[PDB]
A and B are shown apart, each in its own frame.
Chain A
Amino acid sequence: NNYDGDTVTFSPTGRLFQVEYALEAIKQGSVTVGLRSNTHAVLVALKRNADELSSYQKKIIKCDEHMGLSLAGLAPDARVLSNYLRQQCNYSSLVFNRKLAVERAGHLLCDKAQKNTQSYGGRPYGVGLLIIGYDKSGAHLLEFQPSGNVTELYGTAIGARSQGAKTYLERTLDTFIKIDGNPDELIKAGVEAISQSLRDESLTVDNLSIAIVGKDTPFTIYDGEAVAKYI
């Protein structure tokens, strides 16, 4: 109300409204689902088009051979944060001959987002990210909020109507975690999860975007007729 003019102002109840307004931009964004087993980690994203002539906005970005994310909210902010992740992954490889741990990647994103919430002039990031990756401790899935809060999860979903997919994953938890050494079945569970967040529209060939990383699987994105198999 009087305490939402900038990010540097707490409300009387201890709230940061600009951060909450940035959080709101994610809810307006298109749905994207993340889930993993012990061998693989999968991103599924519902891409959004402007109209019938337009292309479908890309949702998934590769950060390294073993790591990448899906976005929901302001796409340019995801480009900035993903670029930063690419650099940090790359710094780790060049300097230490070491693949960046997914947990450490989350810590770096948290701290970068935090600086934008405590300083005058700037603004919070207006995007949410789902980071998947396979490192020395197996498969991983993270959820990034532009408040700075990063959370390691078995499965999750962010964007509009994401609650439906999130409840499904909460039921299916014991099943999909056990899908080891079977990428196609893990993606199926992700496609079935994101389907719980659909209304009116359905998953078409240029609508759906899937990415996977695993034990002997580099981070690879599937679009177009490559995802027709899963429709």
Chain B
Amino acid sequence: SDPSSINGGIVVAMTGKDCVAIACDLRLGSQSLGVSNKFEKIFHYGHVFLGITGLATDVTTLNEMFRYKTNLYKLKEERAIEPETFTQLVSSSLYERRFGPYFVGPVVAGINSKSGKPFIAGFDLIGCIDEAKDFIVSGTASDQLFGMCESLYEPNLEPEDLFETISQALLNAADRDALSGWGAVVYIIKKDEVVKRYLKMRQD
């Protein structure tokens, strides 16, 4: 009934020293029924990464929408969109559906190509921006993620240390949520290299 918890799933993003990390589970379900273990919730437009939790049809729709919009942006601007700018675009796009919204919990992550500054941001379904320094969480195990992130996180983590922190935050949060899990992916993002890692976790 509740559109934000029919399909399930989670996204978490963290900042580190000259790097950001964004991660998600791979589950798609119809309430109790597990349907797919390959439903990735993180996407990228140039160097800007977007995670989206919530109703899966809207996850797909919004990805296709932001691909559409960042492609036109690039053609006109003659440059790839930046995280700060894309964050405002996501906010604007969600709020234009104020009284008929997409049932999603988006999470932006990336590094500004000019300043080199790590950037993360989160949104509610209606476009309100949460620009946290430390971490952003979203999905059906957001409470669990808040608990994990609040205790595990420390500032200025190196890329390979940040990987361990965000991975453990996601995994243990997902294992306390019925509608999350079935695999996980972690992106480690640096100014000019991005590493993608699939995690081994319990499949129940």
In the complex, are there CB atoms of A and B closer than 8 Å? no
A-side residues, CB < 8 A to B, are: none
